[PDB]
Design a binder for this molecule. Structure first.
Ligand SMILES: O=C(O)/C(O)=C/C(=O)c1ccccc1F
Ligand SMILES: [Mg+2]
Ligand SMILES: [Mg+2]
Ligand SMILES: [Mg+2]
Length: 716
């Protein structure tokens, strides 16, 4: 073997070397103490981890049997609730309480704004995401469909001034609505000066100041003719860049070159559903990127931005963070990984490893980067998103795991904070108890609605055929789940203490649609919501300038807008819901999305890909969207909506279409015509045909097996 013996563990040499040579130096942790701690924490917590997974299986078996024993009309909700209560699925609601989490940075406790999620194994994307704390509004408007490409306003190879003027006018309207002038419009501004600590905007006839002078936050250059003006609205910064010599500035009435928005306030560096990491080599690539981010010296085929310097309105130099405040999303409780095996050859639980290793690495972001000031949390916290938890015992386990890791690392208790994903049904219906179990560590709750939809289908798999995938988004259960999450957070005192977050916008090119509709999330009292790209971060920032999330949350206090009956409304399809063409469209759409995602996962180790759907809309796919598609098809197959020939025909029909979409790259192995020779095609087939048998419908068991299979065959 190429393994290292520490107690009962056998550690892959690449991981042992990375920890000793790269992660531990600078933390003052004795390497011998660290590895003995790994051994002891793994030994002590693995039994409870396994017991929690077995409890999931026990509950699901009882629910399967309950549906198979019934024949009655729709579900008697009264009997169903009583059943869930007796089996320990629906637990009592605890008494009211307020969270006690302390030592948390303002970006989380106070600032409302976008949250970006990026795969940590892609160093270039991760750097762009950390740098996405500031983003050009002109770039985001000019380069997307927010400004429609109508006659004369099209994008070309060179600058289209008619389009640029549309961008400029959009941004002037944004300034008027966000930081209004005492009189007149930013559209008519001819210049900016700082006078007696106040901003003066020259108009063609008069001069004017801000309606609220307190929104003037600073400037660069001389007050007499500043190079930029810094504004603030709803806690988010806006920077007007002034340069008449620039390509855009020469066309502008005031010499304005750009408007920069504070955009991705926080970023989640993802080890979970957006990356493919099936062995120690893969995990070390991710850990090393996470280390470079926390030490400040990650650099790609591109570097991290330093902080931004300003002058205060009344004089004085100050700084603003140039980087998004970073979370790391660990994997959840299910999977093991052979990066470490025990003496019997059993793989070690991956979530326990992630806590030890990402927590160790995060110490570097609490201290000075040599490449200047410390990178991440000035208040002394480590921010870990913990996904796919099922109910409050699983949250309490994560808390104990973090407590034990803090001890190994020499950190104060409760340094390691938890972003709780509300993305499994047994968490949703016990959410108050889940928050209480983490009441001194929780820094957000977030509706991971895609995983939640997969869990909805799997939990009630035996109840009957579910509605189509696109219908799910508007079903009663999910609207109740979204309001219930906000209600629980606000009642636990999250306002001013923790984030209340909502889910990802997946249509990466439909930015006009995103700007039109994602405003719903801050209007519902979410202090953050997930975006797929720095560009979408800048555009979603617009929504927090329009919506006073703090005011909305205060207006929601005390309201209880979702009942348990609503939360438990299973999304079963009605009698004769679909024509044959609608059933075929659903199968074809789901098969193409499964194939387009899985082929890059298995053959190239890419955990997130833009995959065009049956309507040619580019969707960002990750494991959760796969969980939905495979579970829905497994459910339709289980209840006779479609046949096994329908499934095979759809996969074979969509496969060469996916081959075409990928013809452009060197590492692509086509699936057609020899389908059963493609490990990726077989993986996609297995996710559907074995989907009903996977634990809680999770995709990782199959995906990890098939990726490792592919790696092994490519190695011989
Ligand atoms: O809704 C969930 O379950 C969830 O966690 C969201 C995501 O993982 C995600 C989905 C698409 C693209 C990137 C992403 F990070
Ligand atoms: Mg999820
Ligand atoms: Mg306001
Ligand atoms: Mg099962």
């Amino acid at each position: 073997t190429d393994r290292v013996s520490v107690g009962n563990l056998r550690i892959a040499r690449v991981l042992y070397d990375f920890v000793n040579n790269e992660a531990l130096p600078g933390t003052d942790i004795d390497p011998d103490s660290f590895w003995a701690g790994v051994d002891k924490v793994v030994a002590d917590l693995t039994p409870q981890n396994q017991a929690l997974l077995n409890a999931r299986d026990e509950l699901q078996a009882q629910i399967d049997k309950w549906h198979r024993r019934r024949v009655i009309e729709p579900i008697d909700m009264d009997a169903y609730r009583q059943f869930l209560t007796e089996i320990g699925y629906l637990l009592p609601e605890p008494d009211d309480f307020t969270i006690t989490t302390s030592g948390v940075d303002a970006e989380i406790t106070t600032t409302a704004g976008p949250q970006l999620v990026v795969p940590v194994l892609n160093a270039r994307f991760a750097l762009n995401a950390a740098n996405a704390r500031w983003g050009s509004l002109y770039d985001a408007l000019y380069g997307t469909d927010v400004i429609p490409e109508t006659d004369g306003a099209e994008k070309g190879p060179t600058y289209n001034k008619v389009r640029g003027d549309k961008v400029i006018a959009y941004a002037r309207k944004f300034l008027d609505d966000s930081v209004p002038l005492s009189s007149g419009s930013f559209g008519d501004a001819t210049g900016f000066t700082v006078q007696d600590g106040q901003l003066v905007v020259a108009l063609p006839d008069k001069s004017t100041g801000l309606a609220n002078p307190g929104q003037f936050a600073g400037y660069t250059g001389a007050a007499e003719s500043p190079t930029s003006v810094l504004l603030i609205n709803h806690g988010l910064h806006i920077e007007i860049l002034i340069d008449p010599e620039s390509q855009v500035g020469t066309t502008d009435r005031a010499g304005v070159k750009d408007v920069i928005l504070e955009s991705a306030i926080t970023t989640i560096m993802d080890f979970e559903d957006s990356v493919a990491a099936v062995d120690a080599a893969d995990k070390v690539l991710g850990y090393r990127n996470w280390l470079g981010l926390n030490k400040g010296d990650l650099a790609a085929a591109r570097v991290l931005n330093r902080d931004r310097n300003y002058t205060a309105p009344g004089g004085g130099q100050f700084t603003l963070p140039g980087r998004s405040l970073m979370f790391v999303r660990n994997v959840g409780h299910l999977m093991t990984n052979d990066a470490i095996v025990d003496t019997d050859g059993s793989e070690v639980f991956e979530g326990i490893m992630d806590a030890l290793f990402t927590g160790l690495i995060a110490i570097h972001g609490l201290k000075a980067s040599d490449v200047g000031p410390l990178i991440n949390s000035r208040t002394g916290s480590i921010y870990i998103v913990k996904p796919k938890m099922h109910g409050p015992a699983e949250v309490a386990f994560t808390c104990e795991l973090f407590s034990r890791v803090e001890d190994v690392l020499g950190l104060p208790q409760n340094t390691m904070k938890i972003g709780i994903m509300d993305e499994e049904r047994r968490t949703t219906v016990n959410l108050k108890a889940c928050i209480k179990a983490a009441a001194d560590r929780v820094v957000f709750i977030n509706t991971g609605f895609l995983d939640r939809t997969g869990d909805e289908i799997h939990t009630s798999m035996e109840a009957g055929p579910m509605v189509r995938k696109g219908t799910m988004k508007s079903q009663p259960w999910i609207l109740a789940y979204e309001d219930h999450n906000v209600d629980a957070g606000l009642a636990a005192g999250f306002s001013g203490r923790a984030q209340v977050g909502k889910g990802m916008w997946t249509m990466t090119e439909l930015m006009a649609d995103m700007v039109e509709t994602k405003i719903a999330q801050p209007r519902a009292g979410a202090s953050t919501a997930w975006v797929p790209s720095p560009t979408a971060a800048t555009l979603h920032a617009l929504h927090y300038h329009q919506v006073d999330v703090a005011a909305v949350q205060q207006g929601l206090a005390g309201k209880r807008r979702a009942t348990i009956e609503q939360l438990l409304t299973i999304p079963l399809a009605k009698e004769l819901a679909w024509a044959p063409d609608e059933i075929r469209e659903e199968v074809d759409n789901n098969c193409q999305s499964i194939l387009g995602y899985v082929v890059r996962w298995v053959d190239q180790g890419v955990g997130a890909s833009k995959v065009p759907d049956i309507h040619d809309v580019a969707l960002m796919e990750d494991r959760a969207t796969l969980r939905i598609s495979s579970q829905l098809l497994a459910n339709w197959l289980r209840h006779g909506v479609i046949t096994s020939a329908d499934v095979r025909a759809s996969l074979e029909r969509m496969a060469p279409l996916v081959d075409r979409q990928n013809a452009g790259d060197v590492a692509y192995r086509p699936m057609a015509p020899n389908f059963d020779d493609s490990i990726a095609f077989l993986a996609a087939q297995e996710l559907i045909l074995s989907g009903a048998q996977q634990p809680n419908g999770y995709t990782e068991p199959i995906l990890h097996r098939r990726r490792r299979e592919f790696k092994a065959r490519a190695a011989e």
